[model samples]
Target chain A: NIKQFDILYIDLNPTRGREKHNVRPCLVINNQMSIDGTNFVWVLPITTRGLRYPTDIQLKTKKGLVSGVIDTVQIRALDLKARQYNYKDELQDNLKNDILKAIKTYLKPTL
Target chain B: RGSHMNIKQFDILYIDLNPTRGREKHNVRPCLVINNQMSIDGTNFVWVLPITTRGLRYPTDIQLKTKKGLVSGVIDTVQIRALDLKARQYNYKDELQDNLKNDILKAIKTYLKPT
Candidate 1:
């Protein structure tokens, strides 16, 4: 079963204008309740295009330590059937904390 | 040959966010329109931040004083979303204060900007 902080491939096709489209790897950020209780999971898209943003978090793959950025701003709620079900990698505790910190900073009330 | 409506930035409107799954806020609730005039004129969708009277507080939630018809509550910044204004029945309630407007804009900038 899919869990929080799991990296998996997803087909994000059929998007609206200006939305991030096409199949790509994404990081699941949903809490356990959302994962276990709902059919939808929130994810942050990942890319190895070498582009960087302040809202991005660097990802390190478990197999080859492949580097990528988790595009935090491109977060979406996707149906479970859209996911590959096979996890690419599970995020380490430190990285998971970093992702949460980034989200909080992005949503911080003050500038 | 006219636009959807006269909806403007910082305009508080009541909208239905029903049929949501997971942890998304649902039901007909008051929302703060965050789209600029240019965006409102250019597209059918408008971005909105949901406001709630839930007693729980988060660092991202901005507290508001009771004004107009809105109650004393907090603006849930993390729950921002885009809704097709033309497809939804949104009722304009009131406009936000200039001071609160600045705060919300700043918060949005922080969310979108590379900090």
Candidate 2:
């Protein structure tokens, strides 16, 4: 029926004074992704844990807004599971604000 | 004299090793040589150090509030990028490193902060 693989679960279980324990948020790796569209109050896919990848990423990025660099987090990769980069030097650690500036400077108004 | 901690990404972060201790047993230190807050259920000793913790505060440093606890890892660097910002692929290397560098610089400005 469904295939399975080893996925490391990592998470942050916030406690009062001490640190959260056993907070390993697991990422489904090499497994059959089954859809559990069931009747529930909240969302699915993350019914077992406190957070997920996309949601957490959004949260972190929102926090980044305090620094006013939210537009820069969007990145381009070669593939879905990219472990390496294709280009090494062109724009390494390039800021998004800079990219926006470049686009505004070079590209003429598309009227 | 010097006590500090670092922060790392939850993604690039890895748990390479495991110990026979649990986090529950991470109670107040029984022995003062090392303030160990680890359990005997293999959660006690994990190679949790990530390279380094960028903004580490010493014991007497009131800049950041932190207690003496056995942290999980070392975070020498931080790479910030929204992996799923869009449904398309991206090269987020620059954005992340840039953010971390900027954050670190801003963090140091706490001295100038009206604390």
Candidate 3:
């Protein structure tokens, strides 16, 4: 079963212009409860592109250090069937916090 | 001619969306104001969705090629965000038709609660 912060290879094919396409590694951002009850999970697309933006999160996995950037702006919901179930590695706690921080910064909610 | 202007829901305006990070939409471009009257009148910030002419239509986007006073583009529902109206230089462009406004609201709902 997929859980939060799990790195999995997914096919994001059949995309429109500017949308991330093709099979690639995506970081699962959905909670375990969502994964268990829903057919889809939210994820951030991971790319080997150089980290160049404040929203980009440097990814570190248990398998090894992934020289990739987690594109926070490209985050979206992904159906579970699109995943190959090839669990790559889980992200560390610090890395997860970084992602959350990026999201909070992007939303910029106010009281 | 510097007087207090009333910004309302479904009002189209050109907003400066600069200082963005990553794939976030940037530049002073056309945007659709989605905040209610109370929020617009009571707060300094207003919610908006960016409009683009990239010809890439997603399921959550509303095409506005046929709309009057606006260029051919798509209202991106995925990039909904708030902007500080006082901090940015913006201009009122046009108002959205009721049907199109309803479509945009429905699209946002689907994006937020994609079941």
DockQ each: 0.09, 0.04, 0.04
lDDT of 3 by residue, A1-111 (tens): 777888888776544334456778888775665556555656777888678765567788877845487877665655566345467777777677677655434333222
Please state every model's RMSD to the true fold in angstroms.
8.1, 20.3, 10.5
lDDT of 2 by residue, A36-63 (tens): 1111000001123333322121111112
> What i-RMS does each candidate reach, in Å?
8.0, 22.8, 11.0
Best by DockQ: 1
True-vs-predicted CA distance for residue A86, candidate 3, Å: 2.2
| TM-score per model over all chains | 0.53, 0.18, 0.50
Residue B80 deviation, candidate 2, in Å? 4.5
Please give the distance, in angstroms, between residue B108's alpha carbon in candidate 3 and its true position after superposition. Answer: 13
- Candidate 3 chain A: minimum summed lDDT over ten consecutive residues — where? A102-111
| TM-score of chain A, cand. 3 | 0.86
Model 1 CA lDDT for position A15: 48
Estimate candidate 1's alpha-carbon lDDT, on a 0 to 1 scale: 0.66
lDDT of 3 by residue, B6-98 (tens): 777777888877644345567888888775665555554556788897876556568763345655578876666656676678888777776
Q: Residue A34, candidate 1: how far off, in angstroms?
A: 2.2
Model 1 residue B73 lDDT score: 62
lDDT string, candidate 2, B4-61, tens digits = 1321221122221121122211222111000012211112211111222325543211
